[PDB]
Write a protein that binds this ligand. Sequence first.
Ligand SMILES: COC(=O)c1cc(O)c2cc(NC(=O)NCCCCNC(=N)NC[C@H]3O[C@@H](n4cnc5c(N)ncnc54)[C@H](O)[C@@H]3O)ccc2c1
Ligand SMILES: COC(=O)c1cc(O)c2cc(NC(=O)NCCCCNC(=N)NC[C@H]3O[C@@H](n4cnc5c(N)ncnc54)[C@H](O)[C@@H]3O)ccc2c1
Ligand SMILES: COC(=O)c1cc(O)c2cc(NC(=O)NCCCCNC(=N)NC[C@H]3O[C@@H](n4cnc5c(N)ncnc54)[C@H](O)[C@@H]3O)ccc2c1
Ligand SMILES: COC(=O)c1cc(O)c2cc(NC(=O)NCCCCNC(=N)NC[C@H]3O[C@@H](n4cnc5c(N)ncnc54)[C@H](O)[C@@H]3O)ccc2c1
Lengths: 343, 341, 342, 342
Amino acid sequence: SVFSERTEESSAVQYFQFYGYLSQQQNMMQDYVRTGTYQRAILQNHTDFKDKIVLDVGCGSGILSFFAAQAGARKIYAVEASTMAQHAEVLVKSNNLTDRIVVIPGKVEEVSLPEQVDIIISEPMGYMLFNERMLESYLHAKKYLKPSGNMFPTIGDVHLAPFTDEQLYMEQFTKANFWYQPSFHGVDLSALRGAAVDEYFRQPVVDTFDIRILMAKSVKYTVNFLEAKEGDLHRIEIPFKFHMLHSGLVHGLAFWFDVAFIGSIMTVWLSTAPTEPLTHWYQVRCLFQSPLFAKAGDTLSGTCLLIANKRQSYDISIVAQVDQTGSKSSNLLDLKNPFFRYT
Amino acid sequence: SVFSERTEESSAVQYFQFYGYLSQQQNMMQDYVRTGTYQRAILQNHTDFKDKIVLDVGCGSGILSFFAAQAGARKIYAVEASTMAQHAEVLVKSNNLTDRIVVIPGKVEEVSLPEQVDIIISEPMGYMLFNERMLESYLHAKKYLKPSGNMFPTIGDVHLAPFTDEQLYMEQFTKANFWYQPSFHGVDLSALRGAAVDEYFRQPVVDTFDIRILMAKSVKYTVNFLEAKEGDLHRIEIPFKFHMLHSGLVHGLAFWFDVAFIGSIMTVWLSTAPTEPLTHWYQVRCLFQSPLFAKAGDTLSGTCLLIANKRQSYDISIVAQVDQTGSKSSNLLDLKNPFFR
Amino acid sequence: SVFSERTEESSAVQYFQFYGYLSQQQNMMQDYVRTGTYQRAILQNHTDFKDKIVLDVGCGSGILSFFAAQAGARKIYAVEASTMAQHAEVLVKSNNLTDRIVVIPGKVEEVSLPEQVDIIISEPMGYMLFNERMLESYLHAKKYLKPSGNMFPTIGDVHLAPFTDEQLYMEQFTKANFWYQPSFHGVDLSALRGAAVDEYFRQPVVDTFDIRILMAKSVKYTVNFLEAKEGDLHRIEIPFKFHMLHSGLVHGLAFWFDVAFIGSIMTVWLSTAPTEPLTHWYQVRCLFQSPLFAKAGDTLSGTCLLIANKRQSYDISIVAQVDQTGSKSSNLLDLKNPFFRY
Amino acid sequence: SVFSERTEESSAVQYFQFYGYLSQQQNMMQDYVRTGTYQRAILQNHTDFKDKIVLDVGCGSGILSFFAAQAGARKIYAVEASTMAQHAEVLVKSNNLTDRIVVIPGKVEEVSLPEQVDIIISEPMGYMLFNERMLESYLHAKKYLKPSGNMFPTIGDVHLAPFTDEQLYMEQFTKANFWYQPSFHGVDLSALRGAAVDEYFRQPVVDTFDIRILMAKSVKYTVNFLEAKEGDLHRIEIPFKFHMLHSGLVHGLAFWFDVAFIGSIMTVWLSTAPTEPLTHWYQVRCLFQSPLFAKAGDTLSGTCLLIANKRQSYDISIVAQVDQTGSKSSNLLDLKNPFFRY
Ligand SMILES: COC(=O)c1cc(O)c2cc(NC(=O)NCCCCNC(=N)NC[C@H]3O[C@@H](n4cnc5c(N)ncnc54)[C@H](O)[C@@H]3O)ccc2c1
Ligand SMILES: COC(=O)c1cc(O)c2cc(NC(=O)NCCCCNC(=N)NC[C@H]3O[C@@H](n4cnc5c(N)ncnc54)[C@H](O)[C@@H]3O)ccc2c1
Ligand SMILES: COC(=O)c1cc(O)c2cc(NC(=O)NCCCCNC(=N)NC[C@H]3O[C@@H](n4cnc5c(N)ncnc54)[C@H](O)[C@@H]3O)ccc2c1
Ligand SMILES: COC(=O)c1cc(O)c2cc(NC(=O)NCCCCNC(=N)NC[C@H]3O[C@@H](n4cnc5c(N)ncnc54)[C@H](O)[C@@H]3O)ccc2c1
């Protein structure tokens, strides 16, 4: 019941319906960097799986469990709450692994596992790492992890960097200005211009971009999944101090993430950086309401505060100022209403 | 309420959140054929509004009410269940129409209107006309219509026609065939190929197409909103008999719709046909899992059956056979998971 | 006889009937690259024929014997099992070479030659080099070759490369899909979908293609006809490891071949590569039933295994996997039912 | 058996291998005029099948049996000699007709049926109706037909007509003239020109043509399958007297056929005429060695003689003369080596 107490029923319904589609599973599977890196992380750390007990949190089609099986896992508990659980069972039988993979339909916060596991595996990451709040389910499942146990992924580093994108900033007002007309089919729309601007600026922009728009080395916030607690992700305060590498108008912050699989043999990384090939996580950009001018050598400092909501998302609050000028800007954004951009 | 008894709370939440965004209101407004045709229908039938009482069902930003006001409506009750009701009120004040347009926040099945109206106006059409099930709310609102009152739109014609599009058919099978692989990173996926094909073929394809793909004259199913009852739309049985004009593989049925605004002065049509400019309704195609071969001269007969569900959509059953050969295809589709091409 | 023990009578009948037609000999002679390269190989190595004894295995119309004669061969035994041996005799008379070219009707495994030869010549190559299994007759005929004799051709290189061709893959699955129909004139065909797909994908595709579809440098398997024995061609195991140069779906393997005529004066090559002008051998592609995704830098390894059958062809088994993912495709192929796509 | 005594094993092997492929079955099935007319003939004559015993000779995939089942047949014995019999069995199970369709693997001349049948159905027609000689198997199967029994098809009409096609005639010599060259890579080929011409002229041309090339109303030779005996098709003598409608050079005879399904309710026709849509039987044209000039009003008379051979085909002998001139021509053709021109 930890899941249903932090999540509106209306949101859980839609969430699980979405991951219940094969088309969606196929998308995730066809991302070769994602699928291949998970496989590489598990198989190259075979000693972390050989004759071990394994929990796969939100197994979907089962693919990560099959990898754990390839690596030599004695026993794998594959938990999945969507109707995809049925399809995972089918694959476990057709691949003759009924003696090693047990699919358990339900939420990991609600099901009973019969024993403690040596290692947990999952793909719980959303946009800017935290969105969809499955990282809480992943951490929750540590109640089943032996003390010496491991987690794959082991850590997550959400990166934050300032960007310049005059054209993105301008789009907002250009769109909002639809309403700034005194006779649209004889109707004066202009009283709504302000509300339109607000709405557009509350949407985090999900797409990719040229790394040339980044104005400073990114700042890293690390969650270590071995030590973290579920509750650590209810309120996430990310302080930042950027040392500006380029002079210009900073229109917002860009977000991406890495996770690392820290095994006994080696550490394997999965990156969603804009310097790396595009994943189904893209990148995320949050605009400031007002651009901040900064010179190369200036510091831009502030806080990104993420406050978990009952729609399995975050309210994002960003405050920033150029320390050498005192010019400051903010923005409050809702990751439950992202703008998926094609410009 | 009738609305909450026919609708899961989870679906209503999302539905009304979607229409609550200004960005979404702007997209509907910027469809010039939609906005312009509604305006033309109302203003050219000014006598249907001059000094009349009006109900606007699901008014959104209020745009249709403003049109009713331009046409000379004494009084317009604008009902809207999303938070857009707040923004509509703002526009009514800034346009100095507080004496003529009264916004009433809530569902039309739940609110109290103080009087009966002469005419109802709404844009309740979804994909394939019926999707989103607002046509029920529109019909429900007739409890407020005087005897001899009018409705704008007045009727809706659904059009059904068989199409050939080998490339469309192949896309879906090409996607589905992912699940045939016997060793995807060493994993045999092929036990799910059937489930994958079923799911993909249950998705109605929302996009446009050249009219050259149509293999017979369309068949028309008319709902007359003046006479129809809310419950008529719970189960909709559309029989069809196409006379094939071209020989080839029929890969599915294509759907579009017209509505007509039948006023005292003139009848104005809003069409979503593929012969007409593209609207935000596009057209919808339902693929058969297996094509049917037909020769020109052959008849293709069957039934399209639409059964309303609690997610404000329809489960669609399409059964079709080429009479001269007995070649038959049955197909089940869910308009709650459309494929946008 | 070695021939009739490795070949069903039904297959030999048809094989020899096919090469017995003048129309078929004209088609082979009109391939100028084939005819011209054979001529160039023989004439430019004239010292390999001047005053030498020659065996032409499966001479057909006789054309290669005439070339050996132009080069100065003392004596040429031209063996041919089809009825074309009589048309070859006619040409030997009309060209006043009765003193130098002796046609011997019959199979080279069955006839008696009166002496040993200095050199053997033949065109025994089929699709993918080996099809029709005449390479065995060519190797069998070495019982007539002196120690230190030569073979023309001398070696054969089979080239294997991975290819991407989505449109090819689609045409065959579109054909196969006929058998998914639940109501073809009211009859449910779909229980045979699996079998139809198998059948279609077992057909090697004989045509040409742009070299741009190739996703890695080809791999070479060499048969040296001087050293090889007839029995070596009963089971042919071709290992391969491709280093992928491009990322994408690998829909199969493409095959072609070169033979080299290694004479005393020079080596002349006859290539059927897609970089070279088209011959009557074209190229051959074997499709995988399921494509393999590979990234550039990945290795694609496996085996092409050819097992000779009694219908003068091979049962081909192709096993390939992307080493970095363990994605694997196994495919069977029957060279006796090729799909001609040109 | 009657089949193996009239057929060389080499030929039977290949024949049955060819019809054993699903790809080939699919081709036959996708010809809508063939498949649809068979269906229409059986269902419109439902009273010929309701609660009746049925034999389907060479059922292939089974499609005609399924039609007999749709029409209400109590029991259908579906005989098929190719490995397609296996696939037909699979379809009978997947269509829940194991109680009504019994697939019997083997040749209809060799298998045991447990009872006599009311009606036989088959698609035994080849090029010019008779080619491949399955019409003999169809007639052979009458040993299983009750006295009142019927046959579908019931009759076959072969149509013969004189044609003009200067360009077709010319092609032959243009091809043959490959050999009429004194130095093809230094070899004199010309001694073979005669033999090449002969070979080309012995090939019946399988393709279609504009009906405007026909110079007289066609002449009809009818086989009634109810009365005919297997041996009647060993030697088929077709006399003809054409009354010329157009003046010009007659370069040969064009052949096509109709079969009729004569039921109790109605007669349904399947035509392969050039006036009708193209089928997988096309039409067949046999050239004269020398064109015959005829004026409109002249009569062109002669005989077409078909003599069955052991390669499941016919040797065709055509003799024709213009009666008013005494200008005569001849031609011996072999339908076992047809030229596909389409
Ligand atoms: C109007 O649209 C929007 O505005 C909108 C907004 C958005 O944010 C959007 C985000 C999108 N997502 C997206 O791109 N993802 C990337 C894919 C990788 C993540 N894969 C993953 N996390 N798999 C988890 C598996 O774990 C299961 N699971 C979870 N919790 C569990 C629990 N407690 N117990 C048991 N099993 C559990 C779950 O069922 C599933 O199988 C896509 C569309 C969007 C549209
Ligand atoms: C992943 O993507 C999917 O899965 C998906 C699936 C889909 O099906 C999608 C469908 C889409 N539809 C769409 O673009 N339509 C445009 C047609 C024009 C507007 N049509 C209409 N009816 N206006 C309603 C107005 O009337 C109000 N209203 C309704 N009911 C009321 C009641 N009872 N009382 C009072 N007011 C009420 C309502 O709030 C609003 O103002 C778009 C996206 C999709 C995505
Ligand atoms: C749908 O169609 C199919 O299914 C199919 C299947 C296929 O595989 C096909 C293959 C095709 N091949 C083809 O175009 N090749 C041309 C390349 C030239 C190779 N030259 C060659 N082989 N000539 C040997 C000569 O040497 C004689 N000879 C052989 N053995 C002998 C022996 N032991 N003793 C004495 N004489 C012997 C022989 O008679 C002949 O004169 C064409 C069509 C196809 C269609
Ligand atoms: C070397 O290339 C050439 O030069 C060549 C020369 C040619 O002449 C060619 C002719 C071609 N033919 C062709 O296009 N036909 C189209 C019409 C098909 C008619 N349908 C049919 N005949 N069905 C027979 C069914 O009846 C079964 N069956 C027969 N006898 C049986 C028996 N005794 N017992 C039991 N079952 C028996 C049989 O297995 C099958 O299922 C094609 C290629 C050619 C190439």
